[PDB]
């Protein structure tokens, strides 16, 4: 008896119906491919999906969801979907015309934060490991994320970050 909670709404998109849930995390996509692979190279509409940052989970665990998967998984923080949608509308509404320079600025400044957020998913430095090991022989790692302060470090499955960050791991043990 757990549940989950919406912490923050990152992006928004229209994608293949069904491309939501656990199979949409960066690591699930790097290991088994994106369930939105081809997408919109002509494909029947999409479904408006939202990229969600979950309370108690680092950004690598971010998943795309629909207003329906959210309601189905009965998650807390549903009010956030309402504010996000309203703010998104307020934002779209001041595109009345804007100057092409206003649109130029918007698209640029939105690519900078876009990239910023991507960095929250890559390990900038392993800082400690666990004494206990998984049946597979993997310990868990305490990770420092790029673009985020040390109060954002989190313990992570060792088999998980090994698939992409075996390097920081090697550098961690190398420094001793």
């Amino acid at each position: 008896e757990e549940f989950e909670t919406i912490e923050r709404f990152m992006d928004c998109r229209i994608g293949r119906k069904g491309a939501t849930g656990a199979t949409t995390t960066i690591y699930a996509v790097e290991a088994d491919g994106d369930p939105n692979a081809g997408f919109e190279k002509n494909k029947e509409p999409g479904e408006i999906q939202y990229l969600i940052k979950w309370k108690g989970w680092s950004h690598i665990h971010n998943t795309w969801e629909t207003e329906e998967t959210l309601k189905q998984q009965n998650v807390r923080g549903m009010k956030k979907l309402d504010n996000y949608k309203k703010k998104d509308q307020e934002t779209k509404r001041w595109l009345k015309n804007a100057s092409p320079e206003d649109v130029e600025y918007y698209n640029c400044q939105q690519e900078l934060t876009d990239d910023l957020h991507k960095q929250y998913q890559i390990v900038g430095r392993i800082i400690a490991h666990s004494n206990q090991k998984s049946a597979a022989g993997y310990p868990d790692y305490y990770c420092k994320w790029q673009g985020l302060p040390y109060s954002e470090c989190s313990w992570e499955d060792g088999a998980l970050i090994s698939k992409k960050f075996q390097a920081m791991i090697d550098e961690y043990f190398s420094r001793k």
Binding site: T25, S130, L160
Partner: peptide, 5 residues
């Protein structure tokens, strides 16, 4: 350490 499961 948990993951999307």
């Amino acid at each position: 350490a948990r993951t999307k499961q």
